Design a protein around this nucleic acid. Structure first.
Lengths: 46, 100, 134, 37
RNA sequence: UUCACAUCGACGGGAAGGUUUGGCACCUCGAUGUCGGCUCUUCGCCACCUGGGGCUGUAGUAUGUUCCAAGGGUUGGGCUGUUCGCCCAUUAAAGCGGUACGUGAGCUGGGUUCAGAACGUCGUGAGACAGUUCGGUCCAUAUCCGGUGUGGGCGUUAGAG
RNA sequence: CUAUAACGGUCCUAAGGUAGCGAAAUUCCUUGUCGGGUAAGUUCCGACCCGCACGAAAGGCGUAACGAUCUGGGCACUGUCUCGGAGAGAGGCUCGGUGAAAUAGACAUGUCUGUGAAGAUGCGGACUACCUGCACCUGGACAGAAAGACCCUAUGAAGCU
RNA sequence: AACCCAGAGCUAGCUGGUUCUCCCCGAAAUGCGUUGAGGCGCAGCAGUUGACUGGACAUCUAGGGGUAAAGCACUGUUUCGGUGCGGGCCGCGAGAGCGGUACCAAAUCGAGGCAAACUCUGAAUACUAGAUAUGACCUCCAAAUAACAGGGGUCAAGGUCGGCCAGUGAGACGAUGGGGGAUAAGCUUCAUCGUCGAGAGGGAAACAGCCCGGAUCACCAGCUAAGGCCCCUAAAUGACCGCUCAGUGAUAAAGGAGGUAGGGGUGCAGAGACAGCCAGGAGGUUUGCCUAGAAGCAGCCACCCUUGAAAGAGUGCGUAAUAGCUCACUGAUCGAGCGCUCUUGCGCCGAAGAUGAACGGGGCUAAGCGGUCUGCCGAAGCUGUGGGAUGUAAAAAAACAU
């Protein structure tokens, strides 16, 4: 004994998924080419 | 058995910091003994309180290397204004009232 | 082992905060036992270690209890923790932070100093190591 | 054997071999024949 | 005898356990029935005895200690309501424990927490003492899971012995 | 001899326990020492005495007889026990007839571990298990029974002084 | 202290109960007083309504404080040495004197710390008080082409007084600074914030209080956050650099270590090394004492010199002790890589419980952990499309903001 144990909430901070590798923390999503705009989608003109 | 636990809870701050606006008669310092001495335009009190005599500003400064020497001044300036927002709010009160 | 004058009977706890300066370079002696881990050290540890290096040296060289406890720790009986009336007459404690010198010993040849201060490190609750007077 | 979890070479002639994990001492004098951790 | 480590290990230090005494008081006061015995389990080990081994300040016979080992074993009584609290006679030994201090919809009620009564003491007094002493109806025709037995349908691709 | 004080001095009250009895239905420490009894007896009998806190009509001490009284040891007698066994009767069991009960949110109602108001069939992982009867046992469903009787609270109720 | 009827539907600050829809706003569990603390009164925080307002957010500058840290001026303690005052002791002698002691102690000095009720000093934040800007969109008019300034119309937003009225008054955990405790508790008590309370959803296996995030609705549409990409479950068993061989990867220390990849220092390596085979390995001398004996090896003192390649009054065993044995040291062959040293990273032992593997399982030598670059999955979040509702507001809308 002489060592406490880690309970609810307390247990969570020790043992939740952390992304502890500086690299993957850094990253950002792909961007893209700007994708020039798109036409209308509907027309009464018929 | 405890014997202990008899605290008073009294409060004694500085009331008007340097470069605030002192009314006349208003208290500058409520103190226990004389940390800050009276300078000019202030009056000591019965219990060493330091209160303003004329409107103006409070200036804490050394009256000796050690002492505070609190003081007051007329400090009247700036009549000039530059804020659009206050005028805007007032303008809205009326426009909306008229609309409704 | 304790102070003579009881300035204030009881004294509440504190906390460790690592050394950064006053690393207590070396003043007396030539070989010190530098602490590394912050902790308390009672007066009874101090007794123990001192005995260790005195009877180990046993031929020459002078010990130096570089630190003196000077703060009381209390202990309460088994009465449901009501009011902490009397426990200061119990052990005293020296708050020892990192980078601090615990003993100093001169007038001793090199390796004899190593055995004295190594044993002395065994009697004592925190990981240390011995330093020479640089 | 003296299963000391931390003992060390003591005779001048201790050999300190590790086998199947266990760090052990073997000396010509079996008083000294220790196995560690 | 000399010899720190065959054996005991002062002075002090670092741990694991969770079963003693405790600290909190989180569930349970439209209720989670207490001590000790009986019967019946089953599990843990850091091992008491039986299986194998080192080391021994082991001549042998005894041992002393540690190491792997839970497969098994782990009496009968006298005293007390009272698990190493204990003398008797053995015995290979006559272990320590966990299981709501295992087990009261299985059992007894010797103790304690009911009403009677008394002793010492406290209280002027009613009464009282985690002091003592004598007496004091512990209820039950299993729905379900569980377990021990035993069947039937049906599956087994045609149907059966 | 050493000890225990026959006998003395001090404050004290109104005075400082007489006779008997005594570890006692009163002695806590305490299974108090010692003797008898027993193979072994914290119970028991006889004594000693530092009576924690016995004691003279809230009587002291002892008594022949009497006790569905409490208590200790005896001889005879035995299933109380060692260590069970067989038997007869009434139930249980099956078939014909009549036919309740308490309980009951709905239950398509597994084990181990983990979790969780910190002791789950209802959540997670793994294992295990055809469906459904009947007899039998009672470890769980914090099973039923009585809105606990212990503990506390209420500027609750009631009884006694 | 009967039973029935009546006052009596007694009283209960205590338990239980309180039924149909939608819409908008939506708390507290704090202080004070209380025969009061599992009540109530006031404040504090909702609603709704009427004024007067000015902000709120960011930025910057002033003003006081004595906290964190530091410090020994103060107070209180605190070790090491200096100094010696003065005192005790020996006595001489019938007075105090020069002194001596490995002597006890008061001020001081040098070195050296420590303190919630110590400060010569002293931050960051916090607080108070000032000025300084500009938020979101539109429609625009004049543009080559933007931008923005030019206006106009909206929308969004702070407070300080009041009115009518509530509920709340033991919060919980997490982070930090602390008291109490044993620097024990999912303990208790306060101060500043977060979530839960009153809040869903995804990650965390399950799992109020940890992480992202905030749920008006529809969608068999898409991009991401926290977290992840072998199977059970979505998505690379994807790239290259390293490190682990224990199933570690899920849990705990002191201590131990020729485990393992590196690093920091150190000397040696043809006036050749650590390996081994080797050879040699003393004279004084039995060192003096003690002891029966002590002769290197019970114990203690001197502890050197001579000889030489080299020998320590001998390293260990042993002998009654001697002797004996062997080490250190030293030359030759073989042959040029080996000692020492502290720490970094990952590991091993130390590390054992009671129903049955308990750590998601299958498993894995990468599907583990350290590092970087790329693609993807991932929520009720953001987008896209389409409805609803509140006000803003006074009218068809439409547009915002929720």
């Amino acid at each position: 004994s002489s060592r406490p144990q880690k309970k609810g909430t307390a247990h969570h901070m020790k043992t939740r998924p952390k992304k502890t590798a500086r690299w993957d923390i850094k990253r950002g999503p792909a961007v893209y080419p700007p994708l020039p705009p798109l036409p209308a989608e509907w027309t009464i003109v018929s | 058995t405890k014997n202990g636990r008899d605290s008073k809870g009294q409060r004694l701050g500085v009331k008007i910091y340097g470069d605030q606006v002192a009314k006349p008669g208003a208290i500058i310092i409520r103190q226990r003994g004389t940390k800050f001495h009276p300078g000019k335009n202030v009056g000591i009190g019965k219990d060493h309180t330091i209160f303003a005599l004329i409107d103006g500003l409070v200036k804490f400064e050394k009256y000796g290397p050690d002492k505070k020497k609190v003081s007051v001044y007329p400090r009247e300036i700036q009549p000039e204004n530059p804020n659009s927002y206050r005028a805007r709010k007032r303008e809205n009160f009326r426009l909306q009232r008229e609309k409704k | 082992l304790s102070p003579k004058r009881t300035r204030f009977r009881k004294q509440h706890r504190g906390r460790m905060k690592g050394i950064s300066y006053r690393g207590n370079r070396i003043c007396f002696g030539r070989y010190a036992l530098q602490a590394l881990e912050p902790a308390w050290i009672t007066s009874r540890q101090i007794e123990a270690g001192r005995r260790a290096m005195t009877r180990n040296a046993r031929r020459g060289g002078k010990i130096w209890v570089r630190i003196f406890p000077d703060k009381p720790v209390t202990v309460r009986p088994a009465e449901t923790r009501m009011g902490s009336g009397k426990g200061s007459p119990e052990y005293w404690v020296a708050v020892v932070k990192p980078g601090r010198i615990l003993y100093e010993i001169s007038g001793v040849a090199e390796n004899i100093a190593r055995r004295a201060v190594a044993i002395a490190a065994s009697k004592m609750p925190i990981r240390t190591q011995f330093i020479i007077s640089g | 054997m003296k299963i000391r979890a931390s003992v060390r070479p003591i005779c001048e002639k201790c050999r300190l071999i590790r086998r199947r994990g266990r760090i052990i001492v073997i000396c010509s004098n079996p008083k000294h024949k220790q196995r560690q951790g």
